C-alpha cells in the first residue's frame, strides 16, 4: 500500500503539474493569436475573457498529452532515483507499477469526463457569447424539410416540407409562415399552404445542436442527437467520428499512459530527464497528429470511423504491452 500510494501520488502530482503548465502555456499562446483579432467591439479584455472561457476545452484537449508527459516525468523521477529497480528487486512486477500509474491517470480520466459532460459544453457557450438555427435543411425518410427559422422554444418561421415516394415523385409541398411545437410528431401552424399531386419529426430540444459542430457536442448531447437522427434520418459520418473519438478518449488516455510507462521501463531507461521530456513531447505531438489525421481520413474513406479511432489506441496498447513484456 505504501509503495502504491507513493507511486500514485508522485505520478498524480507530475500529471497535475504538467496539466497546469500546459493549460497556462496554451492560454497564453492562444491569447497571442487572438490579440491580432482585436477590433472596436473586441478589446484586449474581451479576447482574454474569450481565451479564459475556453480554458476547460484546452484542458480537455490537453489531458491525454498531459497524462502522457506526467507519467513520463514521474516514472523518470522514480527510475533516475533507482526506485523502480528496487521495487522490482523486492517483488513488485512492472505491470503492478503500470497499474498504479493507471490508477493515478484515472483521476485525469474522471476529470475529462466531468469536463466533457458538465464544463466544456457550458463554457464553450460562454466563450462564443463573449466573442436558434436559421435556414435549417433536414431529411426525414423520403421527406425534405427546410425551416427558415427554428427556435429552441418551439417557433418555426417559413417552413417548407416536400414529400416523396419510393419512385421519387412530388406528393405534397406544404408551406407556412408561423408555427409552434406542441407534441412530438405534430406541429401547429398558420397559413397552411399544402399542395397536392401535420406530422414532422423535428424536435426543438435538438435545434440548438444543429449549428454546433459534432466535435464540440458533449457525449450525452451527441448520443441523444445521434439517436434522434438514426431514428428519423441517417447519421452523418462526421457525427460517428465524433462519437467514436469521445467514447475512446479515456481508453486513449490510459493507453498513452501505458505507453509512457513502457517507454520508461524500456527505451527511455537510464536516459536524462530532458531527453525523456523531449520524447514525451514528440509522442504527444505524434498522437495528436495521428488521431486528427485518421479522424479526417475516416470522413474521406469507406471504412467506418470506429476503425480509424480504435486502431491507434489498440496498436499503441499492444506496443506498450510488448515493451513491458521485454522488461
Amino acid at each position: 500500500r505504501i509503495v502504491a500510494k507513493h507511486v500514485t501520488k508522485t505520478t498524480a502530482l507530475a500529471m497535475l503539474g504538467t496539466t497546469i503548465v500546459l493549460v497556462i502555456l496554451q492560454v497564453l499562446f492562444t491569447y497571442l493569436g487572438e490579440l491580432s483579432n482585436l477590433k472596436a467591439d473586441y478589446s484586449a479584455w474581451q479576447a482574454f475573457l474569450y481565451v479564459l472561457w475556453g480554458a476547460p476545452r484546452y484542458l480537455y484537449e490537453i489531458l491525454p498529452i498531459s497524462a502522457l508527459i506526467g507519467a513520463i516525468l514521474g516514472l523518470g523521477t522514480l527510475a533516475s532515483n533507482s526506485e523502480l529497480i528496487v521495487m522490482r528487486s523486492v517483488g513488485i512486477s512492472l505491470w503492478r507499477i503500470v497499474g498504479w500509474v493507471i490508477r493515478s491517470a484515472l483521476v485525469l480520466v474522471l476529470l475529462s469526463f466531468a469536463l466533457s459532460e458538465w464544463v466544456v459544453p457550458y463554457t464553450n457557450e460562454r466563450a462564443n457569447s463573449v466573442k436558434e438555427v436559421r435556414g435549417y435543411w433536414s431529411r426525414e425518410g423520403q421527406r425534405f424539410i427546410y425551416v427558415d427559422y427554428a427556435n429552441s422554444q418551439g417557433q418555426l418561421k417559413r417552413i417548407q416540407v416536400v414529400d416523396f415516394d419510393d419512385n421519387y415523385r412530388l406528393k405534397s409541398v406544404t408551406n407556412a409562415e408561423q408555427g409552434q411545437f406542441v407534441k412530438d410528431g405534430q406541429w401547429l401552424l398558420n397559413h397552411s399552404q399544402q399542395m397536392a399531386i401535420f406530422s414532422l419529426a423535428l424536435q426543438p430540444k435538438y435545434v440548438h445542436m444543429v449549428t454546433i459542430d459534432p466535435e464540440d457536442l458533449s457525449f450525452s448531447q451527441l448520443v441523444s442527437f445521434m439517436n434522434y437522427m438514426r431514428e428519423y434520418s441517417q447519421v452523418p459520418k462526421t457525427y460517428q467520428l465524433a462519437f467514436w473519438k469521445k467514447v475512446a478518449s479515456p481508453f486513449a488516455l490510459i493507453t498513452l499512459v501505458l505507453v509512457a510507462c513502457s517507454f520508461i521501463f524500456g527505451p527511455l531507461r537510464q536516459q536524462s530527464m530532458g531527453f525523456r521530456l523531449v520524447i514525451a513531447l514528440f509522442i504527444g505531438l505524434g498522437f495528436y497528429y495521428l488521431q486528427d489525421f485518421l479522424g479526417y481520413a475516416s470522413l474521406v474513406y469507406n471504412p467506418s470511423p470506429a476503425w480509424f479511432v480504435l486502431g491507434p489506441i489498440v496498436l499503441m496498447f499492444v506496443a506498450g504491452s510488448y515493451l513491458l513484456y521485454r522488461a
Binding site: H6, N81, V86, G91, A327
Partner: protein, 238 residues
C-alpha cells in the same frame, strides 16, 4: 539453499561480452564475482539479478529454474538486489521505506509487521532517523536503510553491486561488518565491485571472470596465487 548458474552468455552490438560464465553459491556464504572491468563481471552480475536478459544459460535456485523468470519473479523467489547508486525512496521516510517492502510480505500481519519494522530499524541503528525523509540522510545511513529495506523482503541471496564504492577506509569496516551480518542471517551474498583488495577480505569464495569467461575459482588465497589472474587482473605485485 543453493544458487547454481551455468553458461551465462550475453552479446551487445554483436560482440559477446559474456561467454560461458558459471558459478555456484550457497545460503549464508559470501561469493565475490570479480574480474577486469568491462570483461563481463558486471554483465554476469546483472543477468543474475535480472536487469539484463539472459541469451544463454540456466539459473537454478534449489532445483527451481529462474532462467525464464523476470526480475520481480526472481525477487519473489528469494533474490534481493542492492544497487550501487542511491536507491532509497526520496520522498518516503526510513520507517516508511522499510514498511513499504514489509507490506509486500504475505506471511506477516500488521501486528508482527510493526514488530519486524522496529527490530529492523534497531538492528541497523537507524531508529533515530526513522521519521526523516530518505533524501535527507547521510550516505552510510542511507545505505543502511537500503539494506534494511532489502532484508525486509526476506531474500535468500543478496546481490550487492559495488558496496565499497565511494567508501572511506574508516567506513569500509562498517560495510564488511554489515556483509558479515548478512551472511550470519542465513543469507548468501554475491558482491561485485572493482575494489578487489577489500572485496577479497570478506568473500569466502571468489570467481574471477576475464575475456567473458570464468578464469579462476576458489578462496581469495587461491585467487591471489593464480598465474592467469595475476597475468590479467591483479598483476605481478599485489
Amino acid at each position: 539453499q543453493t544458487l547454481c548458474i551455468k553458461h551465462l552468455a550475453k552479446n551487445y552490438s554483436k560482440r559477446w561480452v559474456v561467454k560461458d560464465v558459471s558459478f555456484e553459491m550457497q545460503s549464508g556464504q559470501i561469493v565475490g564475482l570479480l574480474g577486469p572491468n568491462g570483461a563481463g563481471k558486471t554483465t554476469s552480475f546483472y543477468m543474475v539479478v535480472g536487469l539484463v536478459r539472459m541469451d544463454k544459460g540456466e539459473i537454478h535456485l534449489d532445483n527451481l529454474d529462474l532462467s525464464d523468470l523476470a526480475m520481480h519473479e526472481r525477487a519473489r523467489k528469494g533474490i534481493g538486489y542492492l544497487p550501487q547508486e542511491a536507491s532509497i525512496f526520496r520522498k518516503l521516510t526510513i520507517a516508511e521505506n522499510i514498511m513499504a517492502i514489509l507490506e509486500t510480505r504475505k506471511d506477516l500481519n500488521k501486528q508482527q509487521r510493526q514488530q519486524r519494522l522496529q527490530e529492523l530499524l534497531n538492528d541497523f541503528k537507524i531508529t533515530h532517523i526513522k521519521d526523516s525523509l530518505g533524501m535527507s540522510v547521510s550516505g552510510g545511513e542511507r545505505r543502511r536503510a537500503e539494506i534494511a529495506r532489502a532484508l525486509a523482503a526476506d531474500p535468500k541471496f543478496m546481490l550487492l553491486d559495488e558496496p565499497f564504492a565511494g567508501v572511506d577506509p574508516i567506513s569500509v569496516g562498517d560495510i564488511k561488518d554489515i556483509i558479515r551480518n548478512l551472511k550470519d542471517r542465513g543469507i548468501g551474498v554475491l558482491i561485485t565491485d572493482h575494489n578487489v583488495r577489500e572485496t577479497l577480505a570478506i568473500c569466502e569464495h571468489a570467481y574471477i571472470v576475464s575475456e567473458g569467461a570464468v578464469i579462476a575459482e576458489g578462496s581469495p588465497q587461491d585467487i591471489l596465487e593464480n598465474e592467469q589472474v595475476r597475468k590479467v587482473y591483479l598483476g605481478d605485485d599485489f
